[PDB]
Design a protein around this ligand. Structure first.
Ligand SMILES: C[C@H](NC(=O)[C@H](Cc1ccc(-c2ccccc2)cc1)CP(=O)(O)[C@H](C)N)C(=O)O
Ligand SMILES: [Yb+3]
Ligand SMILES: [Zn+2]
Length: 610
């Protein structure tokens, strides 16, 4: 039953397993390098083990020490985005289950694909630099040598030396701070993660960070300028944790802290254990974007406890998390709201499938990422096709109470483990043994392995959606003589979420006539809305509908923050508009060197540069 990880060049788990990492490192802002030692505790899974291989990417290796002596190693040739395999020659052959410690001395490259280094001028405070990591999926190898596969789980401890005026945090419990004895201009911050994790959950931030308590087990961390606003925005965090624990079982990670990154953070959120990272584009002022928090919270079970064995099975992580997320929002705001969010997600799945094309391999639920960069394959598919399968199964099997019973048992069953789609399906069948006939009605081959929209669409309550659709249809069907009829009162009874969904519905039929879009600004003043989700869709609608006045607005939003969800389509839309095309390419070229490395790579590909 061989399931090897085709995104990793390291020895697989059937050969050896990393049990622990002790990281001692220093963050050198002058050189943009992290230097140090990664001591890996490795357990052989084989008799007579004499060598092993680790993943690396743009790492400089100084030496490898085992039993107090330097040992032989070799770096193989680079394999594109996978990096370079590092083979280490063990000094003494190991027995099955024998453990040794391998201490590797390394330095990262300034171009590390895991890291973004920000100058003082790129930060809020303008006086100090800043560093943040993003390891998921396969970027941990760009920080340190490791078996860079989610099929292996390890604990870790870390000591990190930084300039003394700065603060380091990690995906771990804080374990104190001291002056660095080898350099009094520096401080050492210490961390312990006692729960076994996949290495993609390793995370580091260094900057001028302050904190505020917002719940019994939560501090919010940011630069001083963002602390007050972040505390309010995310004040529902503890209530969401309590609901998540009801649904998933005990929260095992101790603290649930939040870090609000600078605007170039590439994602909305990342579920780094003990310390979720979020985008500052969540700071709407009204908590309207807090489903992202419910999402990250939910990953403390689906993803962080039960983990995809390889990235081909990423839907397990994401589909289940979206499912749990939408129940948290449903508990807080009602079942009609859960159905509204669910139906929105279907619409986003439509968009993604239309974008890739209905036969495209990246629209399958289970994907084959052999020679595919996970960053290139990344999309809403695993989120929303995954969620749709689960919601479909929920409806098939007797409803949300019953299906939540399965979700909790699933988490319990696979906690601290890494699993495949077949492990999930096998457990679903075991749990629901008395409804196997119902299960055998699902077209498993199509749902799991075929491209395109799923073979069946679930049932959705339409209550909160109907007004959005009605208003969108009024606009699309409007002729010039109907434009006068529209007025600000049209929006009176729409929540921000419904305004967003109005825009999403309308954007699905873009372009609209330019005069329509001008009238929309005239009566609805969407240019004034700072909500990032809303503004994003409004500017897309304006650019796709060829409104030249929106060009500087779209360029501004694309560059002043860097969440790929917003930055990628805005740049792509600006490139497809002949009036803005040359400026879109120029702007990307001018900014590229100060962008996040992954964002830079993907925008370049989108724009067909280099
Ligand atoms: C596309 C990108 N996605 C995210 O950031 C998600 C976390 C997340 C999940 C859901 C939403 C969401 C927001 C509004 C409506 C629907 C979904 C946003 C972010 C990243 P994640 O799954 O926690 C990590 C990759 N494991 C983004 O939004 O920038
Ligand atoms: Yb008419
Ligand atoms: Zn997620």
């Amino acid at each position: 039953p061989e399931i090897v990880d085709t995104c990793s060049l390291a020895s697989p788990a059937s050969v050896c397993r990393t049990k622990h990492l002790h990281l001692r490192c220093s963050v050198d802002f002058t050189r943009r390098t992290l230097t140090g030692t990664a001591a890996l505790t490795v357990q052989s899974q084989e008799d007579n083990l004499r060598s092993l291989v680790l993943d690396t990417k743009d790492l400089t290796i100084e030496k490898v020490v085992i039993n107090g002596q330097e040992v032989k190693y070799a770096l193989g040739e680079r394999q594109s985005y996978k990096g370079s395999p590092m083979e280490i020659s063990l000094p003494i052959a190991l027995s099955k289950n024998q453990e040794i410690v391998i201490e590797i001395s390394f330095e990262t490259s300034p171009k590390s694909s895991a890291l973004q280094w920000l100058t003082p001028e790129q930060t809020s405070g303008k006086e100090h630099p800043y560093l943040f990591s993003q390891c998921q999926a396969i970027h941990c190898r760009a920080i340190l040598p490791c078996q860079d596969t989610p099929s292996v789980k390890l604990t870790y401890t870390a000591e990190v030396s930084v300039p003394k005026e700065l603060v380091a945090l990690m995906s771990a419990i804080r374990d104190g701070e001291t002056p660095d004895p080898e350099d009094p201009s520096r401080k050492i911050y210490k961390f312990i993660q006692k729960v076994p994790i996949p290495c993609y959950l390793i995370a580091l931030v260094v900057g001028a960070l302050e904190s505020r308590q917002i719940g019994p087990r939560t501090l919010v961390w940011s630069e001083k300028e963002q602390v007050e606003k972040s505390a309010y925005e995310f004040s529902e965090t503890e209530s969401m944790l309590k609901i998540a624990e009801d649904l998933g079982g005990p929260y095992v990670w101790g603290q649930y802290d939040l870090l609000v990154l600078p605007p170039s953070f590439p994602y909305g959120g990342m579920e780094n254990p003990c310390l979720t990272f979020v985008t500052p584009t969540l700071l709407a002022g009204d908590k309207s974007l807090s489903n992202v928090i419910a999402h990250e919270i939910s990953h403390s079970w689906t993803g962080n406890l039960v983990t995809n064995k390889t990235w081909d099975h990423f839907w397990l992580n994401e589909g289940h998390t979206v499912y749990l997320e939408r129940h948290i929002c449903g508990r807080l705001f009602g079942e009609k709201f859960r159905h509204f969010n669910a139906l929105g997600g279907w619409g986003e799945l439509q968009n993604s499938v239309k974008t890739f094309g209905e036969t495209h391999p990246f629209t399958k639920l289970v994907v084959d990422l052999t020679d595919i960069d996970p960053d290139v394959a990344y999309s809403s598919v695993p989120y929303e096709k995954g969620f749709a399968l689960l919601f479909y199964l929920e409806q098939l099997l007797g409803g949300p109470e019953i299906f939540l019973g399965f979700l909790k048992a699933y988490v319990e069953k696979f906690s601290y483990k890494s699993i495949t789609t077949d492990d999930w399906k096998d457990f679903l069948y075991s749990y629901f043994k008395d409804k196997v006939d119902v299960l055998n009605q699902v077209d498993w081959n199509a749902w799991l392995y075929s491209p395109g929209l799923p073979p069946i669409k679930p049932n959705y309550d339409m209550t909160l959606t109907n007004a959005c659709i009605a208003l969108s249809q009024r606009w699309i069907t409007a002729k010039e003589d109907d434009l006068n009829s529209f007025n600000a009162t049209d929006l009176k009874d729409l929540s921000s979420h419904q305004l967003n969904e109005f825009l999403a519905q309308t954007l699905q039929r873009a372009p609209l006539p330019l005069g329509h879009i001008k009238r929309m600004q005239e009566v609805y003043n969407f240019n004034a809305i700072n909500n990032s989700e809303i503004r994003f869709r409004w500017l897309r609608l304006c650019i796709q509908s060829k409104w030249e006045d929106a060009i500087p607005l779209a360029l501004k939003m694309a560059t002043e923050q860097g969440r790929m969800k917003f930055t990628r389509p805005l740049f792509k839309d600006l490139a497809a508009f002949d009036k803005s095309h040359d400026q879109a390419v120029r702007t990307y070229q001018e900014h590229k060197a100060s962008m996040h490395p992954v964002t830079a790579m993907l925008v370049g590909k989108d724009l067909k540069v280099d």
